[PDB]
Amino acid sequence: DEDETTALVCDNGSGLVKAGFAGDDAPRAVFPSIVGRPRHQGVMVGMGQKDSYVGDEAQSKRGILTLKYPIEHGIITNWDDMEKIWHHTFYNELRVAPEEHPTLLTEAPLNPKANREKMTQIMFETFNVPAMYVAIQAVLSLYASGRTTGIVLDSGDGVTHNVPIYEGYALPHAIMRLDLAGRDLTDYLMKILTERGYSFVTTAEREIVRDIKEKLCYVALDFENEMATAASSSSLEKSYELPDGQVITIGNERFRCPETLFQPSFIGMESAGIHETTYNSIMKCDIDIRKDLYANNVMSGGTTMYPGIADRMQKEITALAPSTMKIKIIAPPERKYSVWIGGSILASLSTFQQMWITKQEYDEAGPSIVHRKCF
Amino acid sequence: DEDETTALVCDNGSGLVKAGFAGDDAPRAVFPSIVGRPRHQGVMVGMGQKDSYVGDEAQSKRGILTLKYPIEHGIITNWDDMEKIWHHTFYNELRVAPEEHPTLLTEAPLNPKANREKMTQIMFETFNVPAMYVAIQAVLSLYASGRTTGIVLDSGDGVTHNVPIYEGYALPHAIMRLDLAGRDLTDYLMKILTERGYSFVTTAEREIVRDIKEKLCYVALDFENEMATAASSSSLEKSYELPDGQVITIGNERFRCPETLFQPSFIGMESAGIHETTYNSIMKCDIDIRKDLYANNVMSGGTTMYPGIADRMQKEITALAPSTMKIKIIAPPERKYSVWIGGSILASLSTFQQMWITKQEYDEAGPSIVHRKCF
Amino acid sequence: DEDETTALVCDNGSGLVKAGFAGDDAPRAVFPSIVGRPRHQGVMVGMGQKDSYVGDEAQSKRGILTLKYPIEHGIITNWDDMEKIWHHTFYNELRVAPEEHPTLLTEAPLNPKANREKMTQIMFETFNVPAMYVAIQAVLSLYASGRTTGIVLDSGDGVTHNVPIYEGYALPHAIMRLDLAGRDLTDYLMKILTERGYSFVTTAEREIVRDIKEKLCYVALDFENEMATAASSSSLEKSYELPDGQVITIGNERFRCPETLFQPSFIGMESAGIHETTYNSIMKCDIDIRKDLYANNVMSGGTTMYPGIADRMQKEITALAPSTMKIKIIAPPERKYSVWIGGSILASLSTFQQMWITKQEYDEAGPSIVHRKCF
Amino acid sequence: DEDETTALVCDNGSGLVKAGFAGDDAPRAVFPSIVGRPRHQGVMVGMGQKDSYVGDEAQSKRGILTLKYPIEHGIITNWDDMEKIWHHTFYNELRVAPEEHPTLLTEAPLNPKANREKMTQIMFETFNVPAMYVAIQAVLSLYASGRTTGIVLDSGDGVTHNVPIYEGYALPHAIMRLDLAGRDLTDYLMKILTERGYSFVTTAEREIVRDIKEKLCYVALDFENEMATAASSSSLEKSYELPDGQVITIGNERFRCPETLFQPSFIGMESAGIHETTYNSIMKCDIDIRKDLYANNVMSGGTTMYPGIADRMQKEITALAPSTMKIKIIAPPERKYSVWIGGSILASLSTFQQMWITKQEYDEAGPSIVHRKCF
Amino acid sequence: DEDETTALVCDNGSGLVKAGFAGDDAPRAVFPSIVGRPRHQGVMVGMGQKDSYVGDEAQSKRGILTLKYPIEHGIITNWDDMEKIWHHTFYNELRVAPEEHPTLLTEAPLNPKANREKMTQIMFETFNVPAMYVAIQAVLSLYASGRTTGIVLDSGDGVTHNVPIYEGYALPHAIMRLDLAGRDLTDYLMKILTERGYSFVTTAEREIVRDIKEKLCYVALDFENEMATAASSSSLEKSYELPDGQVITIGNERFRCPETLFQPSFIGMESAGIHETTYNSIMKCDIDIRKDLYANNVMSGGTTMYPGIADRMQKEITALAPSTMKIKIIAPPERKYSVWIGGSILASLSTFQQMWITKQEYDEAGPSIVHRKCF
Ligand SMILES: Nc1ncnc2c1ncn2[C@@H]1O[C@H](COP(=O)(O)OP(=O)(O)O)[C@@H](O)[C@H]1O
Ligand SMILES: Nc1ncnc2c1ncn2[C@@H]1O[C@H](COP(=O)(O)OP(=O)(O)O)[C@@H](O)[C@H]1O
Ligand SMILES: Nc1ncnc2c1ncn2[C@@H]1O[C@H](COP(=O)(O)OP(=O)(O)O)[C@@H](O)[C@H]1O
Ligand SMILES: Nc1ncnc2c1ncn2[C@@H]1O[C@H](COP(=O)(O)OP(=O)(O)O)[C@@H](O)[C@H]1O
Ligand SMILES: Nc1ncnc2c1ncn2[C@@H]1O[C@H](COP(=O)(O)OP(=O)(O)O)[C@@H](O)[C@H]1O
Ligand SMILES: [Mg+2]
Ligand SMILES: [Mg+2]
Ligand SMILES: [Mg+2]
Ligand SMILES: [Mg+2]
Ligand SMILES: [Mg+2]
């Protein structure tokens, strides 16, 4: 802390929560965010008569308690129950009071106005923040790696982004709030397993099936060929183990799951497509300036990690876009941390002290002000 | 038969088997499907030294022989032993060879892939089907009553469906394979009887307790009030008789049994709820097109018959769904026969001859093909 | 005999012996089985210096020689001395060698294992049986009258049975080896006579008092009333004559003697009761299947003949068992012959030739084998 | 007693009664529970003209008086006559009035509702309990040994349990009220002795044959091999002595008796099987959480003591359950006392004072309330 | 007498009569019971012209008057003539009127019903008994010596008993009315004397020969050896004197006479045997309870006194009965008085006043009532 407090940073992405102090490599503490209640009554009293919350222990005990995601698609529907997640985050992982160290809140772009004003009140009023700013998901990634120019994609468990940013300026013509996420992607996985005869349907049950994809999955550069080849032989079949109960085998569904990200045709919505999506945003920008963006494409966030993301993405973007154009995915191994890390850099980079807002100003001004001055 | 054979239809639901010829009102022969063996040895020889199978006679003699359901949750685990059920159905009830008259097989949606390919081989190879198609449970109901547009629910002894179908098209976003059934519902009944001091636990024993619910049961429009009122007085108590052994009385447990269908909270799983379930499927459809579905809701199948199913279902759907919306259950007195009857209409409706598959094509193509072209 | 020998059948019940050839109405020769020695020495030599055995002549000469029952409660304690009974039976009544014509042995169920294995050796080794099978008392009755389904009671001079048999199968949950018999019943008679001032105590003496009951006795539908009414007047008193010595009169003890069969309370053991006993066996059967047994109750054997057995048995079974249930005693006038006759039917009913066992197989296998394959 | 009374605990299992004060090692007084009347009249008057009850002295004098078990399968059919057992227990063994020291009642789970409400009235009204709670058999075991997590089996003389409990919570999906017990197991023993030629049939007679098994019996890890080996030689035969009358020898039936517990196939019911039974309960639990239960299996109660219970149980559970899974029986030498001891811990563990119920509350509320708040 | 009369007790065994007042050591007056008439006419008149009766004087004058035993085997055949015996007993030995002091009648168990009802009338009507009870021979012995538990044998001049009694209760399964007595035993003596050339045959003649056995006799532990040894030498021969007429010598027949009691093989009836008899009664009792009876065997009555009764009885009971069992004869030197003395104790032991019956009750009720309430 010293004479002047460090900059506390909190990710609050959608399902995964990242927290910590001023610009520091890797977040101080990471844990999934859930806060449900136990399914039914237990005979014992006073030994286990206490609620399981905020992942971690609650996360470990999946079977007894149903887990609920407080926020969907980067939108907080739960609100009040969610606040405890921050409550747990501040005391424990950080073990610091909200009023002392300034914290950077992170909010997904193009979401209801209410979420940002109300979020401020919860943190600002209940926690009397010493200094705070509602951050934008896509911008922070740029601060980290990828220099200061390019297009960033941060598909997550609830929300995905594709915002074009040139130099110190970013054009708002094609932000692209696609209704896709690793979470719902997981659901598709649950439905397809029926193919293998496995059935999963519950909050904890979903948790177990979730990650299976992380461990097992291929983007497949030529997709079409993959189904015809994988179906032909075991090759990519391999195996995985399901906790105690059984041993599951991820047939050729192992590579088809990732495609919905690329073309929701399988899921059922033709609204967007990753190779088709990244392209539209870049087109709705100055025709003269796109070269800097084509070669500055950087993928950071969830699903980005997915095995071979850059590979399929790379070939497709080239197909639709004109030749003689240099296109790169600049996908870093440290990706997925852009939101917290990049944000941390901005927070404790001094000379940027004025942008942060605190007590007094907000009290004299309407909740609209906190939302104002943000972009 | 004539110059060209009629269309033989076979339900093969899960526990109840329906069979017959081309689109004919009501199925030709109905009987429960079981095929277990006698519990122990009998001294007599040659007079009773023959196995009791395929319900009917086997069904009548419940005490001496344990009955097993060859398929659970619309999933065939037994496979080979089950085939005799069809064997008995073909010779006796229909008394027609499998090679001559074309038959429509019925299969529950979102089940293991293996069931459909393997089922084909058994019927296709062992019976050399002249023509056949693996049907879908939910679709056939629409063909019968309810016009050509709406949402159908066919809760059965093993599997339940809630698939939204608009016009000649159906959206696959929320089929809903709930893990509920009249059968397991029966088990709950067996456990609650302990309340009255009655104990039942065996295949035949379950059979007797099974149907008791059919004879005695109320959905209860306001449930909460029912326990408080029914417990207060005898009113709904009435009575029932148990074969020779005693006379049982279905206390206030008479109306509580049906609720688990509505809210498995009592059974112990919070995954689904009828009023909550039907709603989710409709929501996961085009926001603009839902009105046709709200007013075209039709319930056909087991448990649907349950006294007052439409009543409780009706009021609850209206509560969660927005006002000014017209919702109906279009529950027909002939329901439960949609699978066979509706199917029969499709089978012998001509101009649909090409969809049916037969010998030669399958032999030249992999078992995958029979599974293919189906949806 | 012809090219292939007929089926010789031997009852060997407990005190009464029945023998004969293949399924023939009524047994070839009947006589009580005893084989004791003369009480003391006679002066004459060579004219009467020969032992009196195997009833008949020995039976006629009761005073000079004490008679012993080789088997008690269907259990052979004497063993070796008993074999002569068969010896006499084979040569004389049947006048056929044991090695030629195949014979069916009869054994009481739930008795020591030794009796059946040892019995085989005596007949199998000493007599080299051409073919034989150790039969079960209760089963044979079913073959005769009573169809193929029901419960049979064969109370005898040593052993009684109550085995429930459904169709070609019989459940072993409640065979019921009650420790009751007409013989010991006789003893009760001897003790009660003291009431009338008559004293009997010896093997021959017991023989005379035995049968008296057969000639004089009433089951009494309302028992309680009988003692109060019979004591009031002579009515049922009537009379009987005792060979030469005196003329006895069977007071009201005439109807009380049969009750001990129904309730050994008088004899002194509360273990079983006929009305209470038949009921327990049926209850320990499938709850669903009991109706066939209630209406198929058939009494065959000793004491069954007793005057009015069906009458008292009839009303009582109805009292404890639930109403609306049809119960019958199906007591045939030819009863008591079920063991031999029914058995004879099974023996010479062909197509049942494989079950019979003979020389060679037993020699190569242990005595346990003869016991095995039996049930 | 002091200023505040200690916690009196009463087992009331089914045949064996345990009683005592607040959480104390081993129960204060143990004795079997029976309360029958003498078989017949004795000439002497005023010296022995007094009834023999509540085991102990009554138990010692088995021949003269028939003993009846007031409760079967954890179900009280006798009710009123049974109350004296508690009457004897309170005065004598404890020698304390029911109104002063609070007592914990023990009731078998999944039994008629009436037993728990009526039991309360008898103790609550007739004894005006200062404080009481109707306990659950399975839960208490957990409190003692086995930590706070696992699956417990407490097979007894009338009722058996297999309830899965995780942490301070227990799932009710598979409690498993198997219709098995040490008592009925004894009956099987009585029927098989006929093999050795020994006959037993009466309340006292049963008592003598009962315990014989305790003294002589083997679970047999490979069963099949045991019959083939034991029959081959005397080895396991050994010997036992029957009071005065004779000396019995427990042939190879010594190890077969325990199997019916494992597979009632011998008894005649295929409803359950120990290795098959423990498995089903664990399966009907969260798929993710079962590891804690597999390694936390603890057997406490009757028949559990049976020689080698853990051995056979151990290998079989491992066979059907998937590999790589750690399974233990955590069978303690002090087992069988879990019901009383574990219960005593809960009773006198303070901070659990509110759960106990007393006078006033029950009087103002219906008997349903005492049943309510229990689980 | 005082304000309330003492309890008069009358043995009336069979040949010997015992009489007296309330529980007093040793009977007040003892004398054999006979009442015959003089053989022929005497010339003298008025000096000896009076009948000789009721033993004593009549007994002294054996030659002139033939003596008749009014009762045989504990059965009164004479009836009317016998009453004078009581007539003489009441006036003379007791010198008290029958109406004043209450008296206890003694009756042998398992005798004709008539003897007990008719006996009541004679005493009750002719004597108007102030209070009376028909006692049982065997029970009274227990009251005296031998505690309250055991088996008693009271072989007498006409009747013998072997009734097992446990605690205040006695089981009726094997009372054992053996047809043996010291009297008939005497006859055997008369016949064997022919061996020595002595002839005796008349009522008085029998009296003289009777007692000779009392004075001279050995039970002989090894019997067989005794004939072989005694015949070898004079040893046991010794001598006796016959009144005036001659001096007889009891050769080796001295020890053989007692054996018939043990085995009537010599007399001619194989019905019973002392060592074999005591054993059967104990066996026909609860198998579990026999130990108390084996060690509580007590012999009281006639022939019991016989020299060495306990010796032979002791070794033999041990031979047939299983080892490790403690058996005793608890034969008291005061035995033979159990019937009167033991009875007297019961009579004047107060609190047992209700059992006694008197005038009024019997008059209003049938003679059957006096017989009723007795056991
Ligand atoms: N290495 C990985 N492989 C596959 N999927 C991943 C991987 N890492 C994260 N994910 C998925 O990314 C989603 C969350 O992404 P992310 O954007 O990083 O979190 P947040 O939005 O909370 O900041 C989840 O559905 C998760 O399963
Ligand atoms: N009229 C009825 N009332 C209550 N339950 C019924 C009724 N008819 C059928 N059921 C229940 O419905 C289930 C089988 O339903 P169904 O779907 O019609 O058969 P299937 O799946 O074999 O085609 C059973 O559990 C049965 O008990
Ligand atoms: N007609 C009858 N009336 C009374 N008792 C009879 C009659 N017939 C046979 N009994 C009795 O039945 C007993 C023998 O019965 P049974 O079973 O027929 O013979 P077994 O066991 O030798 O085959 C005897 O005690 C006999 O006295
Ligand atoms: N050590 C033992 N060996 C074999 N059986 C035993 C042993 N201990 C108890 N049993 C049996 O367990 C049964 C009673 O068990 P338990 O559950 O402990 O009593 P309760 O149900 O009354 O609490 C009886 O059938 C008894 O014979
Ligand atoms: N001391 C004795 N020695 C041998 N025999 C005796 C003795 N005392 C009595 N007896 C015989 O016992 C018989 C009468 O026995 P008891 O039972 O005592 O008399 P009661 O039946 O009249 O009561 C007579 O035959 C008598 O001779
Ligand atoms: Mg993110
Ligand atoms: Mg169906
Ligand atoms: Mg018979
Ligand atoms: Mg217990
Ligand atoms: Mg006497």
Any atom of ligand 2 within 6 Å of the Cβ of B11: yes
Interface size between B and D, measured as CB pairs under 8 A: 31
| Nearest partner of B203 among B180, B187, B185, judged by Cα | B187
Distance CA(E151)–CA(E317), nearest Å, equals 13
Q: How far is A176 from chain B (nearest CA, A)?
A: 21
Experimental method of this PDB entry? cryo-EM
Pick from B141, B188, B215, B305 the residue to mutate for probing ligand 2's pocket: most ligand atoms within 8 Å of its CB. B305
Instruction: Tell which phi-psi region holds residue A113, choosing left (phi > 0), alpha (psi between -120 and 50) or beta.
Output: alpha
Neighbouring residues of the ion ligand 7, judged by CB less than 5 Å:
B 13, 156, 301, 339
Kindly give the distance from the C-alpha atom of residue E16 to the centroid of ligand 5, in angstroms, as a whole number: 8
Instruction: Tell which phi-psi region holds residue E263, choosing left (phi > 0), alpha (psi between -120 and 50) or beta.
Output: beta
Nearest-5° Cα angle at A43, A37 to A45: 80
Distance CA(D274)–CA(D262), nearest Å, equals 4
Which secondary structure element, helix H or strand E, spans residue E311, and what is its range? helix E309-320
CB contact under 8 A, C179 and D194: no
What single string gives the DSSP state of each residue in E257-294?
TTHHHH-TTTTT--S--HHHHHHHHHHSS-SSS-HHHH
| Nearest partner of D264 among D163, D160, D180, judged by Cα | D180
Question: How far does CA A126 lie from the centroid of its chain?
Answer: 26
Q: How many CB atoms lie within 10 A of CB A313?
A: 24
Distance (Å) of CA B373 to CA B134, B135, B168: 10, 11, 17
Beta carbons of D339 and D11 less than 8 angstroms apart:
yes
The residue of chain B nearest to residue D76, with distances taken between CA atoms, is B197
Give the three-class secondary structure for B98: coil
Helices (H), chain A: 57-60, 83-88, 113-121, 137-143, 182-192, 203-209, 212-215, 224-232, 253-262, 274-283, 291-294, 309-320, 343-347, 361-364, 367-371
Distance CA(A67)–CA(A37), nearest Å, equals 7
Neighbouring residues of the ion ligand 9, judged by CB less than 5 Å:
D 13, 156, 301, 339
The residue of chain D nearest to residue B193, with distances taken between CA atoms, is D112
CB contact under 8 A, A204 and D355: no
Query: Given the CA of residue C339, which atom of ligand 3 is nearest to it?
Result: 23
- Which one of A67, A179, A192, A195 would you mutate to disrupt binding with B, by most B Cβ within 10 Å of its Cβ? A195
What single string gives the DSSP state of each residue in E203-220?
HHHHHHHTTHHHHS----
Q: How far is C108 from chain D (nearest CA, A)?
A: 12
Give the three-class secondary structure for E72: strand
Any atom of ligand 4 within 6 Å of the Cβ of D15: yes
Distance CA(C144)–CA(C154), nearest Å, equals 13
Beta carbons of B47 and C148 less than 8 angstroms apart:
yes
Tokens of C9: 């059948």
Q: Which chain C residues are closer than 8 Å to B39 by Cβ?
A: 171
Q: Residues E242, E245, E247, E252: is their CA dihedral positive or negative?
A: negative
Tokens of A27: 């977040």
Q: How many CA atoms lie less than 13 Å away from A279 in the CB half-sphere?
A: 16
Q: In what order do the strands lie in the sheet with D16-20?
A: D29-32, D16-20, D8-10, D103-107, D132-136
Q: How far is D200 from chain E (nearest CA, A)?
A: 10
Any atom of ligand 4 within 6 Å of the Cβ of D32: no
Kindly give the distance from the C-alpha atom of residue E155 to the centroid of ligand 10, in angstroms, as a whole number: 7
Distance CA(A355)–CA(E55), nearest Å, equals 143
* CA-based end-to-end distance of chain B: 29
The ligand minimizing its distance to the Cα of A71 is 1
Q: How many CA atoms lie less than 13 Å away from E242 in the CB half-sphere?
A: 16
What single string gives the DSSP state of each residue in A113-127?
HHHHHHHHHIIIIIS
Distance CA(A222)–CA(A314), nearest Å, equals 12
Q: Whose Cα sits closest to atom 1 in ligand 1?
A: A305
Give the three-class secondary structure for B152: strand
Any atom of ligand 2 within 6 Å of the Cβ of B88: no
Hunting for tokens 């209450």 — which residue is that?
A: E102
Q: Which chain D residues are closer than 8 Å to A36 by Cβ?
A: none
Instruction: Set out the domains of chain C in order of their start, with CATH numbers.
Output: 5-31+73-138+338-371 (3.30.420.40), 32-72 (2.30.36.70), 139-185+275-337 (3.30.420.40), 186-274 (3.90.640.10)
Tokens of E345: 């104790």
| Nearest partner of A341 among A106, A86, A15, judged by Cα | A106
Distance CA(E260)–CA(E264), nearest Å, equals 4
| Nearest partner of E153 among E321, E338, E290, judged by Cα | E338
Which residues sit with their C-beta closer than 6 Å to ligand 1? A 11, 13-16, 154, 156-157, 182-183, 210, 214, 301-303, 305-306, 336, 339
Beta carbons of E44 and E32 less than 8 angstroms apart:
no
| Nearest partner of C181 among C162, C159, C207, judged by Cα | C159
Please count the helices (runs of H) and the strands (runs of E) in chain A.
Answer: 15, 11
Hunting for tokens 């103790």 — which residue is that?
A: D123
Distance CA(A335)–CA(D118), nearest Å, equals 68
The answer for residues whose C-beta is within 8 angstroms of residue C35's C-beta and 6 or more apart is C53, C54, C58, C67, C68, C70, C81, C82, C84, C85
Which secondary structure element, helix H or strand E, spans residue C76, and what is its range? strand C75-76
Experimental resolution (Å): 4.7
Give the three-class secondary structure for B209: helix
The answer for residues whose C-beta is within 8 angstroms of residue B210's C-beta and 6 or more apart is B183, B186
Beta bridge partners of C136: C107
Q: Whose Cα sits closest to atom 25 in ligand 2?
A: B182
| Nearest partner of E182 among E208, E151, E153, E214, judged by Cα | E214
Q: In what order do the strands lie in the sheet with E297-299?
A: E169-170, E162-166, E150-153, E297-299
Give the three-class secondary structure for B134: strand
Which residues sit with their C-beta closer than 6 Å to ligand 3? C 11, 13-16, 154, 156-157, 182-183, 210, 214, 301-303, 305-306, 336, 339
Distance CA(B134)–CA(D30), nearest Å, equals 67
**DSSP structure class, residue B178:** B
Pick from D211, D336, D340 the residue to mutate for probing ligand 4's pocket: most ligand atoms within 8 Å of its CB. D336
| Partners of chain B (3+ Cβ pairs below 8 A) | A, C, D
Q: How far is D76 from chain C (nearest CA, A)?
A: 20
Tokens of A196: 């293998």
Distance CA(A38)–CA(A230), nearest Å, equals 42
CB contact under 8 A, E165 and D63: no
- Which one of B51, B57, B62, B64 would you mutate to disrupt binding with C, by most C Cβ within 10 Å of its Cβ? B64
Tell me the three-class secondary structure of chain D, residue by residue.
CCCCCCCEEECCCCCEEEEECCCCCCCCEEEECCCCCECCCCCCCCCCCCCCCCCCHHHHCCCCECCCCCEECCEECCCCCCHHHHHHHHHHHHCCCCCCCCEEEEECCCCCHHHHHHHHHHHHHHCCCCCEEEEEHHHHHHHCCCCCCEEEECCCCCCCCEEEEECCEECCCCCCCCCCCHHHHHHHHHHHHHHCCCCCCCHHHHHHHCCHHHHCCCCCCCCHHHHHHHHHCCCCCCCCCECCCECCCCCCHHHHCCHHHHCCCCCCCCCCCHHHHHHHHHHCCCCCCCHHHHCCEEECCCCCCCCCHHHHHHHHHHHHCCCCCCCCCCCCCCCCCHHHHHHHHHHCCCCCCCCCECCCHHHHCCHHHHHCCCC
Any atom of ligand 5 within 6 Å of the Cβ of E219: no
Any atom of ligand 5 within 6 Å of the Cβ of E157: yes
Distance CA(A299)–CA(A319), nearest Å, equals 19
Beta carbons of A299 and A153 less than 8 angstroms apart:
yes
Distance CA(A136)–CA(A16), nearest Å, equals 16
Q: Which member of D194, D202, D268 has the closest CB to residue C173?
A: D268
What is the total residue count of chain C? 375
Helices (H), chain B: 57-60, 83-88, 113-121, 137-143, 182-192, 203-209, 212-215, 224-232, 253-256, 259-262, 274-283, 291-295, 309-320, 343-347, 361-364, 367-371
Kindly give the distance from the C-alpha atom of residue B358 to the centroid of ligand 7, in angstroms, as a whole number: 25
The residue of chain B nearest to residue D173, with distances taken between CA atoms, is B268
Instruction: Tell which phi-psi region holds residue D30, choosing left (phi > 0), alpha (psi between -120 and 50) or beta.
Output: beta
**DSSP structure class, residue E322:** P
Beta carbons of A104 and A347 less than 8 angstroms apart:
yes
Interface of B with C (CB under 8 A): 38-49, 61-64, 204-205, 207-208, 242-247
- Which one of B184, B189, B201 would you mutate to disrupt binding with D, by most D Cβ within 10 Å of its Cβ? B201
Tell me the three-class secondary structure of A245-310, residue by residue.
CECCCCCCHHHHHHHHHHCCCCCCCCCCCHHHHHHHHHHCCCCCCCHHHHCCEEECCCCCCCCCHH
Beta bridge partners of A134: A105
| CB neighbour burial string for D176-211, b if at least 16 within 10 angstroms, e if fewer | bbbbbbbbbbbbbbbbbbbeeebbbebbbbbbbbbe
Any atom of ligand 2 within 6 Å of the Cβ of B156: yes
Q: How many CB atoms lie within 10 A of CB B25?
A: 9
Kindly give the distance from the C-alpha atom of residue E174 to the centroid of ligand 5, in angstroms, as a whole number: 24
| Burial grade of B168 (CB within 10 A; 0-12, 13-18, 19 or more) | exposed
**DSSP structure class, residue A322:** P
Distance CA(A288)–CA(A116), nearest Å, equals 35
